[PDB]
Design a protein around this ligand. Structure first.
Ligand code: ARE
Ligand code: NAG
Ligand code: CA
Ligand code: CL
Length: 496
């Protein structure tokens, strides 16, 4: 469960939120593989409800109608084609598995689905699976509304509807089998693992019963006995009967406290400063490193739809975001997931964004293709953070320092810190309102290194800042509080 199953030397996965299968296939070959990315988290590949009010929101993909690989991202052929090509180049695919529920109970019956499948929420009829009233928890839920009303009662959190979404009776072997049938179909196609959506709303024991029916990874690409990588989405920030530690037996879990705390520290909210990050990790109340999937922001909380709230950093906060992602990718704690989003028209009113529902860039509902600009950036309103030099170069930085310990930490008692990873890497941050100028111990061998944040090493030279390391491993760093990117990073592979 716990191993990502990525190729030796690749330590991160990227979430290509709402991308089309064909675009991802191309991305695997032209960028992901050459730049050292380990894998890709894709949006739910199964048939979902088509919602026109509001116009095709991103969240309609979390309301399943069937298990047919047919969505706005593409059909089953294009999906299979994407997995094959990505695997052939060393980049794995992780499927977002929405297995806790089906669509909202209020949705109108008919054929308003991404594949024309018929469904009737009112009578609990989903013929394309098939599921009937006997496969839902309507009789098991005890709340008066039928939905989840209090998260302090772990029982209704699991047996009732999450904001109206019809809740699957996962204790029934029939339902467990229909779900395994779906996941095994994907495993046999070549996927390397799954993100279990709304895992908090499922009993750890029901999840385990389903994972027991799963096949080993495809023997054409993976070594015999390979088990699918499993990370469960559980939002646990304390103060609830449900703890993410209850799911350690099924696989890893999403550590939402990670992004929340990093955001407040980097924003310097209510007393926090970067010097406190010295004991970052479990020392902060986080889950063990070998059970954590970490990230700065997610498709959910980057638009206020998840835990984290106001402190969360996103592409909208470019400068601070790059630093946050940089710290995460440099730090040894957990398995890192990089975000890749699209721009939407944020419309704030009373502190809340009324356009948080807006779906991906599209032409009358047809998702726009991801175009690549001459400078490697993306067009058609795709942000492509994974293509930002500062982020892409930190992904590579993680690969280079994989395995090296945390050493040579430094801080000015405020917001200027630095630390290294064994003798393969070093990073410096200046988040104070004044310039940083000092000679630090880097633990790196003597030589001239290229700063991978400001530039790149291109055939014998640096296109940006250059750092000189002496025999005793010391080097001088200068970062004005006015730099576009107030941090510098160098590693063994950026060495001249
Ligand atoms: C969103 C978050 O809510 C909880 O998170 C709780 C948290 O556990 C608790 O501790 C406290 O912080 O409150 C949070 C919000 O209630 C869960 O614990 C967690 O698992 C879940 N996150 C994952 C799963 C779902 C569901 O399929 C997705 O929802 C996403 O899809 C849903 C279905 O299309 C959307 O509902 C939409 O459709 C419903 C249909 O009846 C409508 O009633 C609803 O008004 C509408 O917004 C939802 O807005 C969106 O966020 C989401 O994208 C995905 O990341
Ligand atoms: C690096 O660039 C300089 C010019 O700025 C050039 O003289 C030198 O030969 C280059 N080195 C390599 C290895 O390409
Ligand atoms: Ca449930
Ligand atoms: Cl997530």
């Amino acid at each position: 469960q716990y191993s990502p199953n990525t190729q030796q030397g690749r330590t991160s996965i990227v979430h290509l939120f709402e991308w089309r299968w064909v675009d991802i296939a191309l991305e695997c070959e032209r960028y992901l593989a050459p730049k050292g990315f380990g894998g890709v988290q894709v949006s739910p590949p199964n048939e979902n409800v088509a919602i026109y009010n509001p116009f095709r929101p991103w969240w309609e993909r979390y309301q399943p109608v069937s298990y047919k690989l047919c969505t706005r991202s593409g059909n089953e052929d294009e999906f299979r084609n994407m997995v094959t090509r990505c695997n052939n180049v060393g980049v794995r695919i992780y499927v977002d598995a929405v297995i806790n529920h089906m669509c909202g109970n209020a949705v109108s019956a008919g054929t308003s689905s991404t594949c024309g499948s018929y469904f009737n929420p009112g009578s609990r009829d989903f013929p394309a699976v098939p599921y009937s009233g006997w496969d839902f928890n309507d009789g098991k839920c005890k709340t008066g509304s039928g939905d989840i009303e209090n998260y302090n009662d772990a029982t209704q959190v699991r047996d009732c509807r999450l904001t109206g979404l019809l809740d699957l009776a996962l204790e029934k072997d029939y339902v467990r089998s229909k779900i395994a049938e779906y996941m095994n179909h994907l495993i046999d196609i070549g996927v390397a693992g799954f993100r279990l959506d709304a895992s908090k709303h499922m009993w750890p024991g029901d999840i385990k019963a389903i994972l027991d029916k799963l096949h080993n990874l495809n023997s054409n690409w993976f070594p015999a006995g390979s088990k699918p990588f499993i990370y469960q989405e559980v939002i646990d920030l304390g103060g609830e009967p449900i703890k993410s530690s209850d799911y350690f037996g099924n696989g890893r879990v999403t550590e939402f406290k990670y992004g929340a705390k990093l955001g407040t520290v980097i924003r310097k909210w209510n007393g926090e400063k970067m010097s406190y990050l010295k004991n970052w990790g479990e020392g902060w109340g986080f889950v063990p490193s070998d059970r954590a999937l970490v990230f700065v922001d997610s498709h959910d909380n980057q638009r206020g739809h998840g835990a984290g709230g106001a402190s969360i950093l996103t592409f909208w906060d470019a400068r601070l975001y790059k630093m946050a992602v940089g710290f995460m990718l440099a730090h040894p704690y957990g398995f890192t997931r990089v975000m890749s989003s699209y721009r939407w028209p944020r419309q704030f009113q009373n502190g809340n964004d009324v356009n948080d529902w807006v779906g991906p860039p599209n032409n009358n509902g047809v998702i726009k293709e991801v175009t690549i600009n001459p400078d490697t950036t993306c067009g058609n309103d795709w942000v492509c953070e994974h293509r930002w030099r500062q982020i892409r170069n930190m992904v590579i930085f993680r690969n280079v320092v994989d395995g090296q310990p945390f050493t040579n930490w430094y801080d000015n008692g405020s917001n200027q810190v630095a630390f290294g990873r064994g003798n393969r890497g070093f990073i410096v941050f200046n988040n104070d309102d004044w310039s940083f100028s000092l000679t630090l111990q880097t633990g790196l061998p003597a030589g001239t290194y290229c700063d991978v944040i400001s530039g790149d090493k291109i055939n014998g030279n640096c296109t940006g800042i250059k750092i000189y390391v002496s025999d005793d491993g010391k080097a001088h760093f200068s970062i004005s509080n006015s730099a576009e990117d107030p941090f510098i990073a160098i590693h063994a592979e950026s060495k001249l």
